[PDB]
Coordinates of N, CA and C and ligand atoms in Angstrom, one line a residue:
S1 N -9.1 30.5 29.1 CA -10.0 29.5 28.5 C -11.1 30.1 27.8
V2 N -11.8 29.4 26.8 CA -12.9 30.1 26.2 C -14.0 30.3 27.2
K3 N -14.1 29.5 28.2 CA -15.1 29.7 29.3 C -14.9 31.0 30.0
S4 N -13.6 31.3 30.4 CA -13.3 32.5 31.1 C -13.4 33.7 30.2
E5 N -13.2 33.5 28.9 CA -13.4 34.6 27.9 C -14.9 34.9 27.8
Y6 N -15.8 33.9 27.9 CA -17.2 34.1 27.8 C -17.7 34.9 29.1
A7 N -17.1 34.5 30.3 CA -17.5 35.2 31.5 C -17.1 36.7 31.4
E8 N -15.9 37.0 30.8 CA -15.6 38.4 30.5 C -16.6 39.1 29.6
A9 N -17.0 38.4 28.6 CA -18.0 38.9 27.7 C -19.3 39.0 28.4
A10 N -19.7 38.1 29.3 CA -20.9 38.3 30.1 C -20.8 39.5 30.9
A11 N -19.7 39.9 31.5 CA -19.6 41.1 32.3 C -19.8 42.3 31.4
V12 N -19.2 42.4 30.3 CA -19.5 43.6 29.4 C -21.0 43.7 29.1
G13 N -21.6 42.5 28.8 CA -23.0 42.5 28.6 C -23.8 43.1 29.8
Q14 N -23.4 42.8 31.0 CA -24.1 43.4 32.2 C -23.7 44.9 32.3
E15 N -22.5 45.3 31.9 CA -22.3 46.8 31.9 C -23.2 47.5 31.0
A16 N -23.5 47.0 29.8 CA -24.4 47.6 28.9 C -25.8 47.6 29.5
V17 N -26.2 46.5 30.3 CA -27.5 46.5 31.0 C -27.5 47.7 31.9
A18 N -26.5 47.9 32.7 CA -26.5 49.0 33.7 C -26.6 50.4 33.0
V19 N -25.8 50.6 32.0 CA -25.7 51.9 31.3 C -27.1 52.1 30.6
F20 N -27.7 51.1 30.1 CA -29.0 51.2 29.4 C -30.0 51.7 30.4
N21 N -30.2 51.0 31.5 CA -31.2 51.4 32.4 C -31.0 52.8 32.9
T22 N -29.8 53.2 33.1 CA -29.5 54.6 33.4 C -30.0 55.5 32.3
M23 N -29.6 55.2 31.1 CA -30.0 56.0 29.9 C -31.5 56.1 29.8
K24 N -32.2 55.0 30.1 CA -33.7 55.0 30.1 C -34.2 56.1 31.0
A25 N -33.7 56.1 32.3 CA -34.1 57.1 33.2 C -33.9 58.5 32.7
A26 N -32.7 58.7 32.2 CA -32.4 60.1 31.6 C -33.3 60.5 30.5
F27 N -33.6 59.5 29.6 CA -34.6 59.8 28.6 C -36.0 60.2 29.2
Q28 N -36.5 59.4 30.1 CA -37.7 59.7 30.7 C -37.7 61.1 31.3
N29 N -36.6 61.5 32.0 CA -36.4 62.8 32.6 C -36.2 63.9 31.7
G30 N -35.9 63.6 30.4 CA -35.6 64.7 29.4 C -34.2 65.3 29.4
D31 N -33.3 64.6 30.0 CA -31.9 65.0 30.2 C -31.2 64.5 28.9
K32 N -31.4 65.2 27.8 CA -30.9 64.8 26.5 C -29.3 64.8 26.5
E33 N -28.7 65.7 27.2 CA -27.2 65.7 27.2 C -26.7 64.5 27.9
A34 N -27.3 63.9 28.9 CA -27.0 62.7 29.5 C -27.2 61.6 28.5
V35 N -28.4 61.5 27.9 CA -28.8 60.5 27.0 C -27.7 60.4 25.9
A36 N -27.3 61.5 25.3 CA -26.3 61.4 24.2 C -25.0 60.7 24.7
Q37 N -24.5 61.1 25.9 CA -23.3 60.5 26.4 C -23.5 59.0 26.6
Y38 N -24.6 58.6 27.3 CA -24.9 57.2 27.5 C -25.0 56.4 26.2
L39 N -25.6 57.0 25.1 CA -25.7 56.3 23.8 C -24.3 56.1 23.3
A40 N -23.4 57.0 23.4 CA -22.0 56.9 23.0 C -21.3 55.7 23.8
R41 N -21.5 55.7 25.1 CA -20.9 54.7 25.9 C -21.5 53.3 25.5
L42 N -22.8 53.2 25.3 CA -23.4 52.0 24.9 C -22.8 51.5 23.5
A43 N -22.7 52.4 22.5 CA -22.1 52.0 21.2 C -20.8 51.4 21.4
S44 N -19.9 52.0 22.2 CA -18.6 51.4 22.5 C -18.8 50.0 23.1
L45 N -19.6 49.9 24.1 CA -19.8 48.6 24.8 C -20.3 47.5 23.9
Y46 N -21.3 47.8 23.1 CA -21.8 46.8 22.1 C -20.8 46.4 21.1
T47 N -19.9 47.4 20.7 CA -18.8 47.0 19.8 C -17.9 46.0 20.5
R48 N -17.5 46.2 21.7 CA -16.7 45.3 22.5 C -17.4 44.0 22.7
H49 N -18.6 44.0 23.1 CA -19.3 42.7 23.3 C -19.3 41.9 22.0
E50 N -19.8 42.5 20.9 CA -19.8 41.8 19.6 C -18.5 41.1 19.3
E51 N -17.4 41.8 19.6 CA -16.1 41.3 19.2 C -15.7 40.1 20.0
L52 N -15.9 40.2 21.4 CA -15.7 39.1 22.3 C -16.5 37.9 21.9
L53 N -17.8 38.1 21.5 CA -18.6 37.0 21.0 C -18.1 36.4 19.7
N54 N -17.6 37.2 18.8 CA -17.1 36.6 17.6 C -15.8 35.7 17.9
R55 N -14.9 36.2 18.7 CA -13.8 35.4 19.0 C -14.1 34.1 19.7
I56 N -15.1 34.2 20.6 CA -15.6 33.0 21.3 C -16.2 32.0 20.3
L57 N -17.0 32.5 19.4 CA -17.6 31.6 18.4 C -16.5 30.9 17.6
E58 N -15.6 31.7 17.1 CA -14.5 31.2 16.2 C -13.7 30.2 17.0
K59 N -13.4 30.4 18.3 CA -12.7 29.4 19.1 C -13.5 28.2 19.3
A60 N -14.8 28.3 19.6 CA -15.6 27.1 19.7 C -15.6 26.2 18.5
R61 N -15.6 26.9 17.3 CA -15.5 26.2 16.0 C -14.2 25.5 15.9
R62 N -13.1 26.2 16.2 CA -11.8 25.6 16.1 C -11.6 24.4 17.0
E63 N -12.3 24.4 18.2 CA -12.3 23.4 19.1 C -13.2 22.2 18.8
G64 N -14.0 22.4 17.8 CA -15.0 21.4 17.4 C -16.2 21.2 18.4
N65 N -16.5 22.2 19.1 CA -17.5 22.1 20.2 C -18.9 22.4 19.5
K66 N -19.4 21.4 18.9 CA -20.6 21.6 18.1 C -21.7 22.2 18.8
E67 N -22.0 21.7 20.1 CA -23.2 22.3 20.8 C -22.9 23.8 21.1
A68 N -21.7 24.1 21.5 CA -21.5 25.5 21.8 C -21.6 26.4 20.5
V69 N -21.1 25.8 19.4 CA -21.2 26.6 18.1 C -22.7 26.8 17.8
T70 N -23.5 25.8 17.9 CA -25.0 26.0 17.6 C -25.5 27.1 18.4
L71 N -25.3 27.0 19.8 CA -25.9 28.0 20.7 C -25.3 29.4 20.3
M72 N -24.0 29.5 20.1 CA -23.4 30.8 19.8 C -23.9 31.4 18.4
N73 N -24.1 30.5 17.4 CA -24.7 31.0 16.2 C -26.1 31.6 16.5
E74 N -26.9 30.9 17.3 CA -28.2 31.4 17.6 C -28.1 32.8 18.4
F75 N -27.2 32.8 19.3 CA -27.0 34.0 20.2 C -26.5 35.2 19.4
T76 N -25.5 35.0 18.5 CA -25.0 36.1 17.8 C -26.1 36.7 16.8
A77 N -26.8 35.8 16.2 CA -27.9 36.3 15.3 C -28.8 37.2 16.1
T78 N -29.2 36.8 17.3 CA -30.1 37.6 18.1 C -29.4 38.9 18.5
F79 N -28.1 38.8 19.0 CA -27.4 40.0 19.3 C -27.5 41.0 18.2
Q80 N -27.5 40.6 16.9 CA -27.6 41.6 15.8 C -29.0 42.2 15.7
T81 N -30.0 41.4 16.1 CA -31.3 42.1 16.2 C -31.3 43.2 17.3
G82 N -30.7 42.9 18.4 CA -30.5 44.0 19.4 C -29.7 45.1 18.9
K83 N -28.6 44.8 18.1 CA -27.8 45.9 17.6 C -28.6 46.8 16.6
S84 N -29.4 46.1 15.7 CA -30.2 46.9 14.8 C -31.2 47.8 15.5
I85 N -31.9 47.3 16.5 CA -32.8 48.1 17.2 C -32.1 49.2 18.0
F86 N -30.9 48.9 18.5 CA -30.2 50.0 19.2 C -29.8 51.1 18.2
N87 N -29.4 50.8 17.0 CA -29.0 51.8 16.0 C -30.2 52.6 15.6
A88 N -31.3 51.9 15.3 CA -32.6 52.7 15.0 C -32.9 53.6 16.1
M89 N -32.6 53.2 17.4 CA -32.9 54.1 18.5 C -32.0 55.3 18.5
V90 N -30.7 55.1 18.2 CA -29.8 56.2 18.1 C -30.2 57.2 17.0
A91 N -30.7 56.7 15.9 CA -31.2 57.5 14.8 C -32.5 58.3 15.3
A92 N -33.4 57.7 16.0 CA -34.5 58.3 16.5 C -34.2 59.4 17.5
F93 N -33.1 59.3 18.3 CA -32.6 60.3 19.1 C -32.1 61.5 18.3
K94 N -31.2 61.2 17.4 CA -30.7 62.2 16.4 C -31.9 63.0 15.8
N95 N -32.9 62.3 15.4 CA -34.0 63.0 14.7 C -35.0 63.7 15.6
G96 N -34.9 63.5 16.9 CA -35.9 64.0 17.8 C -37.2 63.3 17.8
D97 N -37.3 62.0 17.5 CA -38.5 61.3 17.4 C -38.6 60.5 18.7
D98 N -39.2 61.1 19.7 CA -39.3 60.4 21.0 C -40.3 59.2 20.9
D99 N -41.3 59.2 20.1 CA -42.2 58.1 19.9 C -41.4 56.9 19.4
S100 N -40.6 57.1 18.3 CA -39.8 55.9 17.9 C -38.8 55.5 18.9
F101 N -38.2 56.5 19.6 CA -37.2 56.1 20.6 C -37.8 55.2 21.7
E102 N -39.0 55.6 22.2 CA -39.7 54.7 23.2 C -39.9 53.3 22.6
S103 N -40.4 53.3 21.4 CA -40.7 52.0 20.8 C -39.5 51.1 20.7
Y104 N -38.4 51.6 20.1 CA -37.2 50.8 20.0 C -36.6 50.5 21.4
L105 N -36.7 51.3 22.4 CA -36.2 51.0 23.7 C -36.9 49.8 24.3
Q106 N -38.2 49.8 24.2 CA -39.0 48.7 24.7 C -38.6 47.4 24.0
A107 N -38.5 47.5 22.6 CA -38.2 46.3 21.8 C -36.8 45.8 22.2
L108 N -35.9 46.7 22.4 CA -34.5 46.2 22.8 C -34.5 45.5 24.1
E109 N -35.3 46.0 25.1 CA -35.5 45.3 26.4 C -36.0 43.9 26.2
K110 N -37.0 43.8 25.3 CA -37.7 42.5 25.2 C -36.8 41.5 24.4
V111 N -36.1 41.9 23.4 CA -35.2 41.1 22.7 C -34.1 40.6 23.7
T112 N -33.7 41.5 24.6 CA -32.6 41.1 25.5 C -33.1 40.1 26.5
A113 N -34.2 40.4 27.2 CA -34.8 39.4 28.1 C -35.0 38.1 27.5
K114 N -35.4 38.0 26.3 CA -35.6 36.7 25.6 C -34.3 35.9 25.5
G115 N -33.3 36.6 25.1 CA -32.0 36.0 24.9 C -31.2 35.5 26.1
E116 N -31.9 35.6 27.3 CA -31.2 35.3 28.5 C -31.0 33.9 28.9
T117 N -32.0 33.0 28.6 CA -31.8 31.6 28.8 C -30.6 31.1 27.9
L118 N -30.6 31.5 26.7 CA -29.5 31.1 25.8 C -28.2 31.5 26.3
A119 N -28.1 32.8 26.8 CA -26.8 33.3 27.3 C -26.3 32.3 28.4
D120 N -27.2 31.9 29.3 CA -26.7 31.0 30.4 C -26.3 29.6 29.8
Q121 N -27.1 29.1 28.8 CA -26.8 27.8 28.3 C -25.4 27.8 27.6
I122 N -25.0 29.0 27.0 CA -23.6 29.0 26.4 C -22.6 28.9 27.5
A123 N -22.7 29.5 28.7 CA -21.7 29.4 29.7 C -21.5 27.9 30.0
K124 N -22.5 27.1 30.1 CA -22.5 25.8 30.5 C -21.9 24.9 29.4
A125 N -22.0 25.3 28.2 CA -21.6 24.4 27.0 C -20.2 24.6 26.7
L126 N -19.6 25.8 27.0 CA -18.2 26.1 26.5 C -17.1 25.2 27.1
Ligands
4JQ201 N1 -29.5 42.2 23.8 C1 -29.0 43.3 23.1 C2 -29.5 44.7 23.3 C3 -29.0 45.8 22.6 C4 -27.9 45.6 21.7 O1 -27.4 46.7 21.1 C5 -26.4 46.6 20.1 O2 -26.0 47.6 19.6 C6 -25.9 45.3 19.8 C7 -26.3 44.2 20.5 C8 -27.4 44.3 21.5 C9 -28.0 43.2 22.2

């Protein structure tokens, strides 16, 4: 069902939460070799999450589930704000700019926490 597909998407989202918090700790500790690996793992995860979200949105559209489509349009747009901040973060790591890395990391956390009520609303609407 589209609902069970969203729960699978929700799990991938929580995996990225776990890998992110770990990567944050590594960054604070200066373990750049770990950070690089966690950033690669996160990029794969966000690619998977985005795709599951697009398939869910497309299915809700084909189903005519107007409320779920509205919420998923809002949620995917925000997802892309998270994705842009993540990519800037990756560039800051490449460039050795720890000040920008810290900034983007905090921003990504705040964009994510904000989008959490909407994430739960989607589960109920699908
Ligand atoms: N909430 C959130 C946080 C980080 C993210 O990074 C990405 O690369 C794509 C989406 C995304 C969403």
